[PDB]
Design an enzyme around this catalytic site. Structure first.
Site, PDB file in Angstrom:
ATOM      1  N   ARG A  61      -1.121  -1.823  -3.756  1.00 17.95           N
ATOM      2  CA  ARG A  61      -1.815  -1.844  -2.196  1.00 17.95           C
ATOM      3  C   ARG A  61      -3.413  -1.893  -2.118  1.00 17.95           C
ATOM      4  NH1 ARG A  61      -4.229   2.251   0.153  1.00 17.95           N
ATOM      5  NH2 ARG A  61      -4.657   3.254  -1.673  1.00 17.95           N
TER       6      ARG A  61
ATOM      7  N   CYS B 123      10.666   8.692   2.464  1.00 23.98           N
ATOM      8  CA  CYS B 123      10.264   9.290   0.917  1.00 23.98           C
ATOM      9  C   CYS B 123       9.190   8.176   0.053  1.00 23.98           C
ATOM     10  CB  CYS B 123      12.103   9.717   0.515  1.00 23.98           C
ATOM     11  SG  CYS B 123      13.077   8.933  -0.082  1.00 23.98           S
TER      12      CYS B 123
ATOM     13  N   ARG C  95      10.689   4.574  -4.650  1.00 20.51           N
ATOM     14  CA  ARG C  95      10.796   3.395  -4.595  1.00 20.51           C
ATOM     15  C   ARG C  95       9.616   3.091  -5.282  1.00 20.51           C
ATOM     16  NH1 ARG C  95       6.939   5.831   0.550  1.00 20.51           N
ATOM     17  NH2 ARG C  95       4.738   4.784  -0.840  1.00 20.51           N
TER      18      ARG C  95
ATOM     19  N   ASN D 169       7.158  11.294 -15.008  1.00 19.18           N
ATOM     20  CA  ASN D 169       8.323  11.967 -13.336  1.00 19.18           C
ATOM     21  C   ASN D 169       9.618  12.369 -14.954  1.00 19.18           C
ATOM     22  OD1 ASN D 169       6.983  10.309 -11.965  1.00 19.18           O
ATOM     23  ND2 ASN D 169       6.928  11.854 -11.708  1.00 19.18           N
TER      24      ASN D 169
ATOM     25  N   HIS E 200       6.991  -1.224 -12.351  1.00 14.60           N
ATOM     26  CA  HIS E 200       5.900  -2.395 -13.080  1.00 14.60           C
ATOM     27  C   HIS E 200       4.555  -1.795 -13.824  1.00 14.60           C
ATOM     28  CE1 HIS E 200       4.913   0.779  -9.552  1.00 14.60           C
ATOM     29  NE2 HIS E 200       3.832   0.747 -10.599  1.00 14.60           N
TER      30      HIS E 200
END
Ligand SMILES: O=c1c(O)cccc2cc(O)c(O)c(O)c12
EC number: 2.1.1.45
Length: 273
Positions: free
Chosen positions: A24, A158, A178, A189, A219
């Site tokens: 991003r 999501c 994703r 996580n 990544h």
């Protein structure tokens, strides 16, 4: 053989076969698409041992999420591009965001102090109820969104889908993300959804089974390569155990002190940007 070896093998694979791809914020990563690993939850708990993982904050943030809070301060007091609105982010009101989705998906949002009982779908209570009413169901599925995406489009994708699964008295969980940040987010996580599995299993009278972690864009940020190169030279130690200290009934009743890690001996903290 160690489940943590999967995580290490995946770091290695990305640093050996990952391709350069910007995120991003035009910031650089090494990326591979599509990965998965399985961690047993039977008589152990996948808190990574090759660096010390901040367990107390994994716990506290999951509790905040389970409470469905949209108040930054209800977490901040534990010490643990998303924007819109003047008086409200001074306040600490985050908007209809995070756990709001697990407990009140789709409810018209008022403020962070508002009472939302019975408004929107409670995905989390729904998972627990389905496990009790129909353990074979293939739809025991709970989704999470990046808050940044909500105002951005209709039907926004999501960020995470979680699916539970029961056989032979064992509760398994698959987490599909994703994208996954292998150096910082991923270990966090793994512990967060293994903890959730332990909680759901406890209140539904099942034994934890497997946690399966699946990624699209797995990544490594350019600036984590070197510390991760060093983490790869460490040998995993036996996973610890997680013990629940009280009998608990309902998923909202859980408190931080209900939980105790045992036999956790990790290698020193690694700081990554
Ligand atoms: O609208 C949705 C939404 O705004 C978020 C993204 C995914 C969803 C998935 C659903 O299954 C559902 O019944 C939905 O209403 C959505």
């Amino acid at each position: 053989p160690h489940g943590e070896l999967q995580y290490l093998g995946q770091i290695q694979h990305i640093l050996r076969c990952g391709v350069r791809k910007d995120d991003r914020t035009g910031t650089g990563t090494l990326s591979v698409f599509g990965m998965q690993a399985r961690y047993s939850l039977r008589d152990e708990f996948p808190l990574l041992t090759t660096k010390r993982v901040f367990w107390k904050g994994v716990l506290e943030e999951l509790l905040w999420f389970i409470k469905g809070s949209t108040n930054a301060k209800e977490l901040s007091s534990k010490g643990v591009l998303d924007s819109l609105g003047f008086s409200t982010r001074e306040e600490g009101d985050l908007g209809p965001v995070y756990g709001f989705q697990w407990r009140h998906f789709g409810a018209e949002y008022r403020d962070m102090e508002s009472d939302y009982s019975g408004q929107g779908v409670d995905q989390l209570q729904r998972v627990i109820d389905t496990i009790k009413t129909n353990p074979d169901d293939r739809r025991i599925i709970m989704c999470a969104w990046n808050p940044r995406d909500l105002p951005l489009m209709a039907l926004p994708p999501c960020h995470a889908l979680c699916q539970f699964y029961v056989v032979n008295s064992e509760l398994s969980c698959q987490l599909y993300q994703r994208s996954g940040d292998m150096g910082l987010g991923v270990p966090f996580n793994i512990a967060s959804y293994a903890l959730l599995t332990y909680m759901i299993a406890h209140i539904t009278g099942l034994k934890p089974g497997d946690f399966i972690h699946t990624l699209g864009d797995a990544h490594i940020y350019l600036n984590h390569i070197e510390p991760l190169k060093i983490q790869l030279q460490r040998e995993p130690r036996p996973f610890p155990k997680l013990r629940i200290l009280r009998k608990v009934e309902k998923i909202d009743d859980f408190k931080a002190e209900d939980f105790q890690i045992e036999g956790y001996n990790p290698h020193p903290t690694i700081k990554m940007e």
